[PDB]
Amino acid sequence: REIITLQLGQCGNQIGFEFWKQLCAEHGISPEAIVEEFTDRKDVFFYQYIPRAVLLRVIHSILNSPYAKLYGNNWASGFSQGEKIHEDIFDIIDREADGSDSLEGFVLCHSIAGTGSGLGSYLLERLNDRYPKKLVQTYSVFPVQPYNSLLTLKRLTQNADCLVVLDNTALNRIATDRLHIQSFSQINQLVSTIMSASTTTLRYPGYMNNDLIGLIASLIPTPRLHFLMTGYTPLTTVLDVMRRLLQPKNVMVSNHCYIAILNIIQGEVDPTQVHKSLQRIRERKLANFIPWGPASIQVALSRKSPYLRVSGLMMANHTSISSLFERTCRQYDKLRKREDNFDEMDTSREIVQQLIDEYHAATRPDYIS
Amino acid sequence: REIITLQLGQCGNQIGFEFWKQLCAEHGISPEAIVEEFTDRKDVFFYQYIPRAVLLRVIHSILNSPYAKLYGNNWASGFSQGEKIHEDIFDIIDREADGSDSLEGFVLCHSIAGTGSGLGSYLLERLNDRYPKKLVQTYSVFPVQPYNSLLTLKRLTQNADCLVVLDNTALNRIATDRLHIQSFSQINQLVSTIMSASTTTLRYPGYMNNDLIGLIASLIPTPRLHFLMTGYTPLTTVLDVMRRLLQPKNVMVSNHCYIAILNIIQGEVDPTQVHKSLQRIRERKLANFIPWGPASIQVALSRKSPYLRVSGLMMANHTSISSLFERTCRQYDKLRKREDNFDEMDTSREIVQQLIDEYHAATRPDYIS
Amino acid sequence: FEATINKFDKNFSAHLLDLLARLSIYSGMASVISRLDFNGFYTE
Amino acid sequence: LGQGDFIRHLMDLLKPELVRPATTLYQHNLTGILETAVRATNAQFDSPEILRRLDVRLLEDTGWDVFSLDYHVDGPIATVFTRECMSHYLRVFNFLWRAKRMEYILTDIR
Numbered sequence A, B: 001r002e003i004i005t006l007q008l009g010q011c012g013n014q015i016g017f018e019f020w021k022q023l024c025a026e027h028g029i030s031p032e033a034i035v036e037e038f039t040d041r042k043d044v045f046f047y048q049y050i051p052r053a054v055l056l057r058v059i060h061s062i063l064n065s066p067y068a069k070l071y072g073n074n075w076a077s078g079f080s081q082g083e084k085i086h087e088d089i090f091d092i093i094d095r096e097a098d099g100s101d102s103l104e105g106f107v108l109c110h111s112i113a114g115t116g117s118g119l120g121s122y123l124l125e126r127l128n129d130r131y132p133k134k135l136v137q138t139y140s141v142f143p144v145q146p147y148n149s150l151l152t153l154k155r156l157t158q159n160a161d162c163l164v165v166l167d168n169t170a171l172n173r174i175a176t177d178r179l180h181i182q183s184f185s186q187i188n189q190l191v192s193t194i195m196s197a198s199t200t201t202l203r204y205p206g207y208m209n210n211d212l213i214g215l216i217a218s219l220i221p222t223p224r225l226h227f228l229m230t231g232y233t234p235l236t237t238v239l240d241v242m243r244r245l246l247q248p249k250n251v252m253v254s255n256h257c258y259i260a261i262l263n264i265i266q267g268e269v270d271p272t273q274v275h276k277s278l279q280r281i282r283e284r285k286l287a288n289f290i291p292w293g294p295a296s297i298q299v300a301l302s303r304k305s306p307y308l309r310v311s312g313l314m315m316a317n318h319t320s321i322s323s324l325f326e327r328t329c330r331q332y333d334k335l336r337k338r339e340d341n342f343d344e345m346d347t348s349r350e351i352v353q354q355l356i357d358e359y360h361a362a363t364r365p366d367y368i369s
Numbered sequence C: 001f002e003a004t005i006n007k008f009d010k011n012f013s014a015h016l017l018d019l020l021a022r023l024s025i026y027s028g029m030a031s032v033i034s035r036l037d038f039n040g041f042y043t044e
Numbered sequence D: 001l002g003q004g005d006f007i008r009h010l011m012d013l014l015k016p017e018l019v020r021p022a023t024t025l026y027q028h029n030l031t032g033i034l035e036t037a038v039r040a041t042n043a044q045f046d047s048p049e050i051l052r053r054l055d056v057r058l059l060e061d062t063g064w065d066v067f068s069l070d071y072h073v074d075g076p077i078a079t080v081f082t083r084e085c086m087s088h089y090l091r092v093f094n095f096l097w098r099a100k101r102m103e104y105i106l107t108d109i110r
């Protein structure tokens, strides 16, 4: 199985280019895309080596980089121009899909704040038209900005099969808190570490989690509640890493309860004490879970790249993510009373109201029906 | 069994003159027709050493070259003058035929684009009259030009028992892509590489393919589908070479499926992983064939000349060759609506339409009947 | 004549299918089948 | 099943075969499929000696009830396994095969 990545807008190209640099250095791949002498299954993200990227001014600075051998602002303006080059960009994808052995999914890296955001919303719909059996995971990044943000939300709630949220307000606070930057090329260092760590169990094979659906099938309970948040602690026993991930200071998100948790421990930790820690974390009751259906916490180990110590990443599904949509929602209404049909905004405003209504009702003892 | 070759027109002379130069060096033969001291069967093309060639103002360019001791624009002008010297050039071919032990074929090198077109059309007709048991292979080269081109195709579809296409257009790309020429003196260097490596199994005897009729009857299943295209990768295991031959970037051609494939591996590669690569090519499905009849792929090894590293050539019988005809067929009707019987052109027009239909019928699961 | 060519077909194709039936039933002697058919033909 | 990467591809290729009843199943066909999996996955970069012993066996219904790997071992190394470890691994391999198809079913439904 293989996973084709797409990079849209200024953000997608930058965080994708930094994702590939980190992923090339994590492996034994020279900047000239040639394997150096110096186990890690790399057929999923690299093609025999060529990355399976589809990039869409910034391209020139990439081509002037040492990695050249590795390959307006409205939403309506970003939607229309994609329609006029509909056939163009798909030929690149159609040859890469059929040239691929057995396609699995489509990773999308884009910022929803505007030509790239508009182009993304267009492409997300067409992929549902052509390929019905391919997952679409989107590494969206949150910030007329309220308008564009909610429109793409209308597509991300019914088209994208999964979604991992990364908001700049939580990342910028971290850079000033634990990095003391006072830049885009600086916070992207953290975004690259989370992205590279997200697909760790795919490149280093283990007994479990050898496919992208294996990670997603546990967290997302119903096709509607497909939003996730992240947590990265080291900015050492396994009990220490678990307790530091469940603190609010580390999450990348600005009653409520958890639906499912996945922990990625990438160190050389002792794999015999991992089952012990899950016995004791349950006793302190550090996290509150859904009352309707059963839920648990998941811990998965891996191996760090020797060519480059314990780290940790936590993928969670918390209903407190509903607050982020509320801010965009409330920000939209204030502009709607202040200034060919303007009916698409009405439908998008309505459908996101149902998503928020699902979350607040997802925390009740009778979410069934 | 000896093969007497013919060269017509400026093209046939230039490719043949550079074909012999590639052969004279591949053996220990000085340009003075004298063997140099410095196992390879050399009795097919050379007569004890003199090449069996019958050429027909470029001739003076050869007589001044150091190899001197080795021997209008209308299609009607070619067919007319060829009738005036019917007895002259047939005196030479006949005296060269009986002097040989047992004639086998007539490898004829001509371009269908001035006098080589009309004269070659005359020869291929006259050979089938007197010599009814002699194979006639032709290394025709593809470029009023639409007229002279298709008229030769009328004869090449019912007289020539084989045909190897080499279009200057696709060659010019490879001249530009991987050689960066912008010239005839350069593209012919690639043509001479294809012609010489085509008969590498006749001059170097191996387990099989010790006669021209062995290379012909394997690929050409029926008397009509007798058009072949070539593929030459070196411009490392057997899997490295086999994968590169099937890429459309290497074929000298500008649903669809193969009919028969023959691979020529001129390396010193061990013959134990050969079946392994063929096993792999079936798994990944890098090429498809006809559904009606049992079509298999054949691979043949040989030995490089020590007097001169892994290479590779592929003899292909692909249905996509029908595209080159349509380009000729199309431009003809346009010239037919733009301007003693003018019936030969229309009669030739009909038989080319019968051929193209036979190709597009070859890709049907009911090609029989 | 025309009734004899088709007579060889039903006779030869039946004899060939007896071969791949016995060449397959074993514990190379198995890679020979991949040499006989390559297009999935003779899948009967 | 400690590899995971190889058993994933091996469960995708045996799906069209094992759905049929066992009567139409013959061992000589599956070996070409197993050999294909070992070539595609990361198990290709491996010692050729140990890959010579890894084969298939047919237990004696449906194709998901008679398939199992064997990895026969004879010689001096056979004094560590002694025909009882090979009668215990297969006793284990069933429980790891069932708990592996009961999961790839539940990720197909999802």
Ligand SMILES: Nc1nc2c(ncn2[C@@H]2O[C@H](COP(=O)(O)OP(=O)(O)O)[C@@H](O)[C@H]2O)c(=O)[nH]1
Residues within 6 Å of the ligand: A009, A010, A011, A014, A015, A072, A073, A111, A113, A114, A115, A116, A117, A141, A142, A143, A168, A184, A185, A187, A188, A191
């Ligand atoms: N997280 C993150 N966001 C970025 C980065 N660069 C740009 N962005 C976002 O992208 C938005 C600007 O989009 P822009 O590039 O003007 O869109 P375009 O002009 O259509 O390509 C801003 O609101 C940022 O939040 C980055 O390096 N990291």
Ligand SMILES: Nc1nc2c(ncn2[C@@H]2O[C@H](COP(=O)(O)OP(=O)(O)O)[C@@H](O)[C@H]2O)c(=O)[nH]1
Residues within 6 Å of the ligand: B008, B009, B010, B011, B014, B015, B072, B073, B111, B113, B114, B115, B116, B117, B141, B142, B143, B168, B184, B185, B187, B188, B191
């Ligand atoms: N590939 C190749 N084709 C050639 C070369 N020289 C001539 N031709 C082809 O031959 C055609 C011209 O034929 P021409 O010399 O006029 O025939 P003539 O009237 O008998 O002399 C052109 O369309 C070219 O495509 C060569 O060196 N290489």
